[PDB]
Amino acid sequence: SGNGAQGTKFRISLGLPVGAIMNCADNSGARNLYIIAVKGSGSRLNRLPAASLGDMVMATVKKGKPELRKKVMPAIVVRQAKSWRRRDGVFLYFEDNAGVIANPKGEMKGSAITGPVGKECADLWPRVASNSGVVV
Amino acid sequence: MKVEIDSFSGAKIYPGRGTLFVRGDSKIFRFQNSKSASLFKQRKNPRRIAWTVLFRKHHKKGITEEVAKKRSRKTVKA
Amino acid sequence: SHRKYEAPRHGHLGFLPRKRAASIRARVKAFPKDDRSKPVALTSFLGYKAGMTTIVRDLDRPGSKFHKREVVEAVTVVDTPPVVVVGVVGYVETPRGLRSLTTVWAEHLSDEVKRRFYKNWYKSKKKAFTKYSAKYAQDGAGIERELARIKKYASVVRVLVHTQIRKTPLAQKKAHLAEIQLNGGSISEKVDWAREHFEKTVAVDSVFEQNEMIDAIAVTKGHGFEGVTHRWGTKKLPRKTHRGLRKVACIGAWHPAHVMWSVARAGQRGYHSRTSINHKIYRVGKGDDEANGATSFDRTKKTITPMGGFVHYGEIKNDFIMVKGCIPGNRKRIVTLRKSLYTNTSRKALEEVSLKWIDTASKFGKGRFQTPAEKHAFMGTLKKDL
Amino acid sequence: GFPMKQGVLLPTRIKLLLTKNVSCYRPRRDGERKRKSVRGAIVGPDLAVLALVIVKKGE
RNA sequence: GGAUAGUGGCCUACCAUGGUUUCAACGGGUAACGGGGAAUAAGGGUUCGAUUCCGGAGAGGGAGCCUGAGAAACGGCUACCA
RNA sequence: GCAGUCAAGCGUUCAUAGCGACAUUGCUUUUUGAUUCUUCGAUGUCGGCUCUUCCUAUCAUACCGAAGCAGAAUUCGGUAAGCGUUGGAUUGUUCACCCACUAAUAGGGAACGUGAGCUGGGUUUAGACCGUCGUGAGACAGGUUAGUUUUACCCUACUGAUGAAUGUUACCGCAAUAGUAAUUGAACUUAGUACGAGAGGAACAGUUCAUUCGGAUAAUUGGUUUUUGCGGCUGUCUGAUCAGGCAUUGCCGCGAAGCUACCAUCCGCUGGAUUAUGGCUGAACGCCUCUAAGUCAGAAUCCAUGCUAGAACGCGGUGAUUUC
RNA sequence: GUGAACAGCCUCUAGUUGAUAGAAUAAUGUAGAUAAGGGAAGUCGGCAAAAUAGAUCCGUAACUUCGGGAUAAGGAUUGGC
Ligand SMILES: [Mg+2]
Ligand SMILES: [Mg+2]
Ligand SMILES: [Mg+2]
Ligand SMILES: [Mg+2]
Ligand SMILES: [Mg+2]
Ligand SMILES: [Mg+2]
Ligand SMILES: [Mg+2]
Ligand SMILES: [Mg+2]
Ligand SMILES: [Mg+2]
Ligand SMILES: [Mg+2]
Ligand SMILES: [Mg+2]
Ligand SMILES: [Mg+2]
Ligand SMILES: [Mg+2]
Ligand SMILES: [Mg+2]
Ligand SMILES: [Mg+2]
Ligand SMILES: [Mg+2]
Ligand SMILES: [Mg+2]
Ligand SMILES: [Mg+2]
Ligand SMILES: [Mg+2]
Ligand SMILES: [Mg+2]
Ligand SMILES: [Mg+2]
Ligand SMILES: [Mg+2]
Ligand SMILES: [Mg+2]
Ligand SMILES: [Mg+2]
Ligand SMILES: [Mg+2]
Ligand SMILES: [Mg+2]
Ligand SMILES: [Mg+2]
Ligand SMILES: [Mg+2]
Ligand SMILES: [Mg+2]
Ligand SMILES: [Mg+2]
Ligand SMILES: [Mg+2]
Ligand SMILES: [Mg+2]
Ligand SMILES: [Mg+2]
Ligand SMILES: [Mg+2]
Ligand SMILES: [Mg+2]
Ligand SMILES: [Mg+2]
Ligand SMILES: [Mg+2]
Ligand SMILES: [Mg+2]
Ligand SMILES: [Mg+2]
Ligand SMILES: [Mg+2]
Ligand SMILES: [Mg+2]
Ligand SMILES: [Mg+2]
Ligand SMILES: [Mg+2]
Ligand SMILES: [Mg+2]
Ligand SMILES: [Mg+2]
Ligand SMILES: [Mg+2]
Ligand SMILES: [Mg+2]
Ligand SMILES: [Mg+2]
Ligand SMILES: [Mg+2]
Ligand SMILES: [Mg+2]
Ligand SMILES: [Mg+2]
Ligand SMILES: [Mg+2]
Ligand SMILES: [Mg+2]
Ligand SMILES: [Mg+2]
Ligand SMILES: [Mg+2]
Ligand SMILES: [Mg+2]
Ligand SMILES: [Mg+2]
Ligand SMILES: [Mg+2]
Ligand SMILES: [Mg+2]
Ligand SMILES: [Mg+2]
Ligand SMILES: [Mg+2]
Ligand SMILES: [Mg+2]
Ligand SMILES: [Mg+2]
Ligand SMILES: [Mg+2]
Ligand SMILES: [Mg+2]
Ligand SMILES: [Mg+2]
Ligand SMILES: [Mg+2]
Ligand SMILES: [Mg+2]
Ligand SMILES: [Mg+2]
Ligand SMILES: [Mg+2]
Ligand SMILES: [Mg+2]
Ligand SMILES: [Mg+2]
Ligand SMILES: [Mg+2]
Ligand SMILES: [Mg+2]
Ligand SMILES: [Mg+2]
Ligand SMILES: [Mg+2]
Ligand SMILES: [Mg+2]
Ligand SMILES: [Mg+2]
Ligand SMILES: [Mg+2]
Ligand SMILES: [Mg+2]
Ligand SMILES: [Mg+2]
Ligand SMILES: [Mg+2]
Ligand SMILES: [Mg+2]
Ligand SMILES: [Mg+2]
Ligand SMILES: [Mg+2]
Ligand SMILES: [Mg+2]
Ligand SMILES: [Mg+2]
Ligand SMILES: [Mg+2]
Ligand SMILES: [Mg+2]
Ligand SMILES: [Mg+2]
Ligand SMILES: [Mg+2]
Ligand SMILES: [Mg+2]
Ligand SMILES: [Mg+2]
Ligand SMILES: [Mg+2]
Ligand SMILES: [Mg+2]
Ligand SMILES: [Mg+2]
């Protein structure tokens, strides 16, 4: 959540704390994303900031095209294996933890994304709905 | 308000009850409880589990009046 | 030195002492303002928390992402069989506070409430109120005078009601008596209403409309002696800490040379009296109504009791209140519902809630079927049949 | 607008491979099989139109 | 024996221990499709041929396959990857 | 370390919007000194962890005044400590230095708070290596490595828990005093609007969500499993079968109930009086002035409302009050 | 008996059943365990704990004093009948 995201994300259960590495679902040349921060996060002594879905994280590329490594870049979470609950009462969880590289406005860097996506993320980032195949 | 069925057990999962799993290939699986979800997560074959619907269905279990002569005819001749 | 890192204080201070409460029946420390333009009626009610269940309904939030979409919410149901008015207490204003002037009582009193005045009911001779009821033998002129006193003085009026515990699956057999403020018209009109209801009964529909924001007052669950870790939420200590770790490391500074009231210490957790507010009423059910759990969209003839009954409580056979969410108190505890102390629009209040389906599947386990019919339908015939 | 197909399963939508002689599919070449989506055969609230035939008149 | 339209380790079961190599196997390279041919004129050669004709291979990369006399076709389908 | 006074100067012009020389007056006791009063028949040495309260010389958040404030931004100042002030990499570190989020990542006190609270990385015994010095033993506000952290049953404090005696016993209540809590952000809309040549570019009302904090609760989901509840498995033992024993709860899958998680759900009230500040009326002082008398408005403040406890030596109403 | 085995676990002979009891099962402990999603962000430091493990088969690097490194690494397999 943050800059350039139209709409409002209901509180979705967390589960991707800093240090977590998630699969890169786009075709930018990166295959993993090491989370290092969470845009729009809280501050509480010793509480590790976490991202849940559609949240904008600051990450680094640990395995991928050398031109994407050794640097920090924004990323948007599209899949999280931690089960959360929607207002419609469903306790759902994906099979992995995945995100895609994006710029601060929210525009992506990859042509498209491989794998399903959560509506909460699509409903939050417009350029994701375009490059996303199947939501939820 | 749809009442779904377990992807393993085949039992009715009312609103809220159970869990939902979105496989990597975007295939969906709905479970009524931790039990069916665990058996599935264990890679157990439902038609080998004596209590699931698709097991009973595949094993001729409890259907004698649903398959019998009926009186469903039509109106004809104009 | 200073704290070296800021963090908010653990626990709320306006909830001290964290001691056991004085009684299971939490006290209603406040009643709503009184507009005498309205008719006389109760301002609170008694019940017993029976349990919780799940409900599905359409959400009317003009601007929410779930607007007009179905939502699944948690709700509690409190068995609230009609209360019975047996007395009226008038209170007068004094420079040292409000004080009770007189307490007129009903002629006859049900044994339910009568045993409340006893601690060993069977051994006793059950002579309570025996001499009192007799001041009614003549025209009586006692009751009339004391009531007349309440009219001339006692600018605030309260009725003495008690629960019909006999009509509840509970086994306690001891009714619950309490004072309820009348928020109707003229003080004379108030006492008049109280007198006219002596030994009579009052239902919940006559005191609570549907969709109303009501507050709940009750004693929370008991947990006994609790370590400072879970009693206050303090951080667990590291593994290598000798002399235990579910504690607070620095109980306080060298100066002041005393442990401070504001420090977190080990003690009694639970059994605290709480006053939760703004619980929207979803359903106001009647016990003499089959299909209690039915809705205009569901329509199946089923009561609210889950299959197998409410775990640890039983069945609901009387009027009941279904409030959105959870309320303080545990299963089988005497609860007091009270009309909120203020008008609140909030766009969340005033929501004309309309249920769609109420869960009735068993709660004593991972239930699958709503009604025994549904169970037999999806399951077929068994060996215990035929 | 997805049409249903009698007898299959699932009052939801699925994707099958259809051939000659099969419902909801008009081949365009000889031996041409195509993968197309079809709605189930169990009525649901998602249906915009229901096809029905009378077998007995009323009153 | 099976499978093929058919021969054949094509494939399978059993069995054996063979098969190629300084007369260069095996591997590597190729800014490699092969050939008819083109360029350079003592001769012997040296260099080139993606490219009008013949043959082969492919249809973004693979694999799979329906129709058929004929396709493992792609201005056919199916799946995966891009 | 912090704050003034005078005002030559800086600031296009202009001393004081924001600054400020020369000088001069002060405050502070988380600097370092200076002293050597107390402790050498011992007051356990730095850091961090944890947790509480306090200070304001206020970083953020509330309301304001000023600008060299057009908008946006920012700066100066007032009332203000009600509230919050974080996640990491190297370092034993305090400090430092980056990375990163954030409304902000403000400074401090509490025996430089906090070792019968921990930890013991550093320092600072005994082993040992190297460098420098010494003939040598040995030495180094030089560099390395290894090196036992004791006791609470007392009193008090604090947290919770019983309790004699005011005729006996019981039910309903009052409310002194004490405690008290909520917090901050984003988006939609306003609105590409106000303002500007332009680039740029707000806010008040409304709505949807979120952060920090708190009190509950267990319908749902997840965790937990001596339900040793059901099934399964290895080894042995009861001749076999059945059914079982033993293997520090033998192992495994499922597993209710209970307990429980921002890993789950629900709830977190509204009146008044003020501050700064801006004003009304209005003298002193025939004019002028928010002030002198009187007076309006107004803040995350304050007092109430609400919430918690109920004085075991504060209290009210009401029931029943014994025969060997 | 299991198994490579004087291992561990169960048994025969022989020998014990000797350790103050009784009732509960608050906090905090000592000792034994499990934990969703993340996976060292904890910390002086992965302290602690977890993970690994037998056997058969395949596969095994730099470097080397040629003796090693090497169970290197990395894999598949295992009951019963
Ligand atoms: Mg967030
Ligand atoms: Mg920390
Ligand atoms: Mg590398
Ligand atoms: Mg595109
Ligand atoms: Mg479970
Ligand atoms: Mg501080
Ligand atoms: Mg009287
Ligand atoms: Mg515990
Ligand atoms: Mg230790
Ligand atoms: Mg001390
Ligand atoms: Mg042959
Ligand atoms: Mg050979
Ligand atoms: Mg050669
Ligand atoms: Mg080539
Ligand atoms: Mg060539
Ligand atoms: Mg030639
Ligand atoms: Mg030549
Ligand atoms: Mg050619
Ligand atoms: Mg070429
Ligand atoms: Mg071809
Ligand atoms: Mg091309
Ligand atoms: Mg093709
Ligand atoms: Mg073409
Ligand atoms: Mg062609
Ligand atoms: Mg001067
Ligand atoms: Mg000048
Ligand atoms: Mg000027
Ligand atoms: Mg200083
Ligand atoms: Mg000294
Ligand atoms: Mg001394
Ligand atoms: Mg000394
Ligand atoms: Mg001492
Ligand atoms: Mg000393
Ligand atoms: Mg001391
Ligand atoms: Mg100017
Ligand atoms: Mg200044
Ligand atoms: Mg000011
Ligand atoms: Mg404060
Ligand atoms: Mg104060
Ligand atoms: Mg920091
Ligand atoms: Mg750290
Ligand atoms: Mg560190
Ligand atoms: Mg540097
Ligand atoms: Mg000091
Ligand atoms: Mg100290
Ligand atoms: Mg110590
Ligand atoms: Mg040390
Ligand atoms: Mg030491
Ligand atoms: Mg060290
Ligand atoms: Mg030493
Ligand atoms: Mg010396
Ligand atoms: Mg030294
Ligand atoms: Mg050392
Ligand atoms: Mg050692
Ligand atoms: Mg002692
Ligand atoms: Mg005490
Ligand atoms: Mg006496
Ligand atoms: Mg806060
Ligand atoms: Mg706009
Ligand atoms: Mg301009
Ligand atoms: Mg909370
Ligand atoms: Mg809790
Ligand atoms: Mg339950
Ligand atoms: Mg469960
Ligand atoms: Mg068993
Ligand atoms: Mg066996
Ligand atoms: Mg048998
Ligand atoms: Mg034995
Ligand atoms: Mg043993
Ligand atoms: Mg165990
Ligand atoms: Mg459970
Ligand atoms: Mg109010
Ligand atoms: Mg007041
Ligand atoms: Mg004034
Ligand atoms: Mg004045
Ligand atoms: Mg004056
Ligand atoms: Mg406030
Ligand atoms: Mg309140
Ligand atoms: Mg008292
Ligand atoms: Mg009294
Ligand atoms: Mg023998
Ligand atoms: Mg002993
Ligand atoms: Mg013993
Ligand atoms: Mg004992
Ligand atoms: Mg324990
Ligand atoms: Mg387990
Ligand atoms: Mg875990
Ligand atoms: Mg991992
Ligand atoms: Mg680490
Ligand atoms: Mg790592
Ligand atoms: Mg170290
Ligand atoms: Mg370190
Ligand atoms: Mg270890
Ligand atoms: Mg494990
Ligand atoms: Mg090695
Ligand atoms: Mg086998």
Side-chain angles (χ1 to χ4, degrees), chain C residues 19 25 64 99 103 131 179 265 273-274 348:
Chain C
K19 75 178 283 264
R25 183 174 70 77
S64 197
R99 93 163 189 100
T103 336
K131 296 182 170 48
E179 283 177 8
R265 324 283 335 255
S273 40
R274 295 287 129 100
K348 277 80 188 73

Side-chain angles (χ1 to χ4, degrees), chain C residues 204-219:
Chain C
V204 192
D205 40 73
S206 41
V207 57
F208 289 128
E209 322 166 50
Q210 203 194 260
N211 311 11
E212 195 29 76
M213 303 316 291
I214 55 159
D215 316 329
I217 300 173
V219 169

Side-chain angles (χ1 to χ4, degrees), chain B residues 7-22:
Chain B
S7 292
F8 188 99
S9 159
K12 291 179 150 215
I13 79 164
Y14 263 89
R17 326 279 307 219
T19 321
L20 190 139
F21 169 41
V22 172

Side-chain angles (χ1 to χ4, degrees), chain B residues 8 45-53 55-56 59 61:
Chain B
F8 188 99
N45 183 22
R47 38 183 52 72
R48 310 203 68 183
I49 293 306
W51 60 266
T52 168
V53 173
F55 168 98
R56 313 187 82 249
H59 269 103
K61 283 299 205 251

Side-chain angles (χ1 to χ4, degrees), chain C residues 64-91 93-97 99-105:
Chain C
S64 197
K65 190 230 182 292
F66 260 62
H67 177 32
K68 284 168 103 174
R69 224 217 284 181
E70 312 184 283
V71 307
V72 183
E73 292 183 341
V75 292
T76 61
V77 52
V78 48
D79 185 0
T80 61
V83 85
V84 48
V85 161
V86 305
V88 60
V89 357
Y91 290 75
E93 317 157 62
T94 86
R96 31 191 190 148
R99 93 163 189 100
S100 67
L101 194 47
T102 325
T103 336
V104 195
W105 294 77

Side-chain angles (χ1 to χ4, degrees), chain C residues 151-253:
Chain C
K151 306 208 184 174
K152 195 191 199 192
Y153 313 108
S155 267
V156 307
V157 190
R158 282 167 196 182
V159 286
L160 279 163
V161 312
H162 84 78
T163 81
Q164 288 209 71
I165 213 182
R166 52 170 256 114
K167 305 204 157 318
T168 284
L170 277 174
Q172 215 206 58
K173 291 195 185 219
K174 212 175 185 180
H176 280 84
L177 160 60
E179 283 177 8
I180 298 191
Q181 171 163 312
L182 285 183
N183 263 14
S186 176
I187 330 172
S188 156
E189 283 179 310
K190 282 173 189 302
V191 48
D192 267 328
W193 182 101
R195 205 290 168 222
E196 300 168 0
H197 287 81
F198 272 16
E199 315 154 60
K200 266 114 198 183
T201 186
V202 162
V204 192
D205 40 73
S206 41
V207 57
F208 289 128
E209 322 166 50
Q210 203 194 260
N211 311 11
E212 195 29 76
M213 303 316 291
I214 55 159
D215 316 329
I217 300 173
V219 169
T220 70
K221 205 203 283 169
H223 300 270
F225 222 91
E226 184 58 58
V228 77
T229 281
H230 197 218
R231 169 165 149 114
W232 289 103
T234 176
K235 179 141 294 168
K236 224 178 171 210
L237 294 173
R239 209 190 52 81
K240 317 208 304 195
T241 81
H242 164 80
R243 264 179 262 281
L245 55 97
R246 303 201 102 226
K247 318 167 144 206
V248 169
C250 171
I251 210 184

